[PDB]
Amino acid sequence: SQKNGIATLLQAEKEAHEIVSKARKYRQDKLKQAKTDAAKEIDSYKIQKDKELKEF
Amino acid sequence: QRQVIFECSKFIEV
Numbered sequence: 552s553q554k555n556g557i558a559t560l561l562q563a564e565k566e567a568h569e570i571v572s573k574a575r576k577y578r579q580d581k582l583k584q585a586k587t588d589a590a591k592e593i594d595s596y597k598i599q600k601d602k603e604l605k606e607f
Numbered sequence: 608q609r610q611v612i613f614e615c616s617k618f619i620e621v
Binding site: 553554557 | 618619620621
């Protein structure tokens with residue numbers, strides 16, 4: 552059980568490290584997404600102002 | 608430091 556037990560440890564540690572990295576990956580990706588989904592809101596509001604500026 | 612590697616690779620091989 553010497554290398555079976557160590558095998559258990561080694562595999563668990565790879566698996567923990569990867570789940571936590573997946574949540575960290577998720578945070579990077581959401582902050583970039585925030586930067587993206589704010590870029591969309593700006594130019595729909597600007598063209599709204601362009602539309603009623605054209606009425607003048 | 609050589610011996611604590613020789614006596615701890617053996618513990619994993621057991």
